Design a protein around this ligand. Structure first.
Ligand SMILES: CC(C)N1CCN(c2ccc(/C(=C(/CCCO)c3ccccc3)c3ccc(O)cc3)cc2)CC1
Length: 222
């Protein structure tokens, strides 16, 4: 077991809770408030998590911003997916917040979440392990295709470090399947697809607020 995967496991943020309001009756407005409140608390720990990724904090501050601005929804969704593996037709946003099909219909999220459930179903059949989760998550941040990177070279380096770490691990604990790392990489499109659609929905129903995401990430990064 190599040191990248080992440190990435160590850098996992702790459990966040959504704390839905037991007073408020379940409605479509409730769901968004809960998910909004939970996402904001996750975003704070997601930026701490990034800084422990080897080489991330050596990037320029604009490149740190560009990676997080490109990948934040992918990172949120991957977490939901991983927590959902041992459940059935349900998305585990938090240990205290689980959304089944009817609550997704009510939240206006049915199509999004059915796609997120394809991703869950797919990691189930490959028996996805925590070490692959945290490595795929790190790859998703680094492979996020930002429009404006200052140092293309350093960013490709971080890609290739995390890429090699994934290949390394799979060569290690998965000899039964010499193509498992390639299969892992091939689930990255579905994750970009649902995140692309989720971010678009984020903006359709105007959840961005007043402060643009790039200054929020600048504040959190300092
Ligand atoms: C005002 C500004 C500071 N922001 C920052 C971020 N913020 C936000 C970010 C992400 C969502 C996500 C849902 C669920 C996606 C589908 O399952 C979502 C709901 C509606 C539209 C798009 C996404 C979501 C995903 C994973 C997860 O662990 C938790 C939350 C919701 C809100 C609102 C507040």
């Amino acid at each position: 077991y190599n040191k990248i995967v080992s440190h990435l496991l160590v850098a996992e943020p702790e459990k966040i809770y959504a704390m839905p309001d037991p007073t408020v009756p379940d409605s479509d407005i409730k769901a968004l408030t809960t998910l909004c409140d939970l996402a904001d608390r996750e975003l704070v720990v997601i930026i701490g998590w990034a800084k422990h990724i080897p080489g991330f904090s050596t990037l320029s501050l604009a490149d740190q911003m560009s990676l997080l601005q490109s990948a934040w929804m992918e990172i949120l969704i991957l977490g939901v997916v991983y927590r959902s593996l041992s459940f059935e037709d349900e998305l585990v946003y938090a240990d205290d917040y689980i959304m089944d099909e009817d609550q997704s219909k009510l939240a206006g999220l049915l199509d999004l979440n059915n796609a997120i459930l394809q991703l869950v179903k797919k990691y189930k059949s490959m028996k996805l392990e925590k070490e692959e989760f945290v490595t795929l998550k790190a790859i998703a941040l680094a492979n996020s295709d930002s429009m404006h990177i200052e140092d293309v070279e350093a960013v490709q380096k971080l890609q290739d470090v995390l890429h090699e770490a994934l290949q390394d691990y799979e060569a290690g604990q998965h000899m039964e399947d010499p193509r498992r790392a390639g299969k892992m990489l091939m689930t990255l499109p579905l994750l970009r697809q649902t995140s692309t659609k989720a971010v678009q929905h984020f903006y359709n129903i105007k959840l961005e607020g007043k402060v643009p995401m790039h200054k929020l990430f600048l504040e959190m990064l300092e």
